[PDB]
Symmetry: C4
Subunit: 176 residues, 4 copies
Amino acid sequence: SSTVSTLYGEVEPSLLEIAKQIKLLICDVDGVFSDGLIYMGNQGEELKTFHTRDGYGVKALMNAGIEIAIITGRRSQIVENRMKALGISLIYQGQDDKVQAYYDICQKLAIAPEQTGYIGDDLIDWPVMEKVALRVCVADGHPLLAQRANYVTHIKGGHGAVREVCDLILQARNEL
Amino acid sequence: SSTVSTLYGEVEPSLLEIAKQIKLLICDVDGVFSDGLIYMGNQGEELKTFHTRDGYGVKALMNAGIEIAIITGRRSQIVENRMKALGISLIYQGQDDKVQAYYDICQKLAIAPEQTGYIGDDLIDWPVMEKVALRVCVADGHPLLAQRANYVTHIKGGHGAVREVCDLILQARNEL
Amino acid sequence: STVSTLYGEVEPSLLEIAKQIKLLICDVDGVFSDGLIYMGNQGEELKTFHTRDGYGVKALMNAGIEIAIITGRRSQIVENRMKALGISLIYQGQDDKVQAYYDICQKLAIAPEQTGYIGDDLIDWPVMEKVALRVCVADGHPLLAQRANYVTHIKGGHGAVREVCDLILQARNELDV
Amino acid sequence: SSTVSTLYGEVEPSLLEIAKQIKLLICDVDGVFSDGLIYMGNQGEELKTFHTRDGYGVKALMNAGIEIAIITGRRSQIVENRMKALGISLIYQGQDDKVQAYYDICQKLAIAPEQTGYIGDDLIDWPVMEKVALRVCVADGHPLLAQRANYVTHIKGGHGAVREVCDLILQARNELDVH
Ligand SMILES: [Mg+2]
Ligand SMILES: [Mg+2]
Ligand SMILES: [Mg+2]
Ligand SMILES: [Mg+2]
């Protein structure tokens, strides 16, 4: 074939061409930054997990001048805390309609969809992904989303899937 | 046309026909909505996990007019909170004998066992499953239960097993 | 050559050992729990237990088989959970694991030949070597795994205890009573 | 073939020679002692996991006279609590650049890089690892670090990767028989 090695497997050269040119990466939270689990307690405690290797990836992308934004349907202090800690400021929570949040991001940043990527794990993510150039489903994402993606990560959501996509972009940019 | 492709594998047309008819889906909690773990704390705290992709599936079935009920042997505020959040009201906790809860559900809804499904992970679930049309064991459920089931999920309990069953019914209904 | 179980294949002589077990002794961390200690910034600590193990232990006791715990650590979380399961013979903070075993053997009048033990690390070996059914969980320490006469297929904290309950219950034709 | 069996696989005798003479083992925390996850709550609670069998290994090394040091980029009371429970004193947290902490450890203990090991899981660990003799990446560490390591653990970070390295050292010291 015509495939090129990554740190994680093989991709079409056409995908690296797309990845090279990304200036905006938008991520869902649950199932992408986390593994999709919501930890619930009898006193109404709620936890969520994030992976340490993802932080390093996001920071590397932003150091390269790539904007990062988050769009999620849930709303938590957890997400505010984590995203602020990673230095991500474009945070959209409580979104039933992810398309409108995406439009708001577009109007703020003025970045074209050909230069935008999105990492999702479920069907609610599809209306935005469909519009952009890099369409990522995490390894364990909904199989119907995985069918529609142009990159399916090797690493599971919440375990380094975000880092994998950061590494893909950096490799494409010849910075890794 | 021996089998019909789903998002997860291949099913017999007879099984999709059973799925198409389902008006009531009954689920166990631990090992089905969760991975079977109970997290216990040094001040008596308790956590349990639920998965975001399951939440989406359960809402989709309810939007389609299908009733959802829960039967669990344990009792927690966690389960009350999670089920109310999803809009599930038929919640049976602290049930050692699941058959009595099943009969109560049947009488409350006037829905026949031929239009009912049950998702279980252990032997206590079998007395209810044996009565109903769609008898699901989660992928990692007890292996004797898996042998008796007429559908074994591919996704593990607590990670989208419930969503997989939701998808099967929605596919069967031509709504996926 | 081997006999099938719900989980894989064993020697008939192992099933024959399992059939006559009257006492099953378990360590806790890495056996009932997933081997992790969840620690928080305000001194929170969590430990996990698995619902299919709970069911197995109750089924084993319903069948007339005694359950005891011997752990090197002391945990009130563990006291709470074992008491909830109906287990009464709980020995914690046990440096001399073998002395605890001796006391259990005496208190119940059950011989080592009718006893099994489920462990995950080397500190478990001094009690294990004394008993007939010597179990290491699937993801136990490899030195203990190579000494065990049954290595579970299911990982620690995820049904390994249930798997051993099932081995005994299958040997007795009592898997689903 | 020149390899020697361990409890986990095969290694070159050269690696056992290095492991035999380690006097200092430096570890990252997240992804090495833990599974790399940070549990965060709505009241700002934080949890981290540690594996029950790693303590026996760390203690066995300390009882052999081997010094243990910890260098992490994150900061938590969790890590203070866990490491103090092991009798470890050289705990460096909130380290953006791990090389400085390493130099400080060298100053304090006067142990040379040739007698030093490091267990990491990501690229930030490499500038210290590159300087020392035993260079461990955990099984599921970042693939670029795994390429650079001289030992890649079989067991995943947070599930006994630390214990595995302890066992390698004990085996090398002839304190742990492997048939
Ligand atoms: Mg999601
Ligand atoms: Mg269950
Ligand atoms: Mg243990
Ligand atoms: Mg790390």
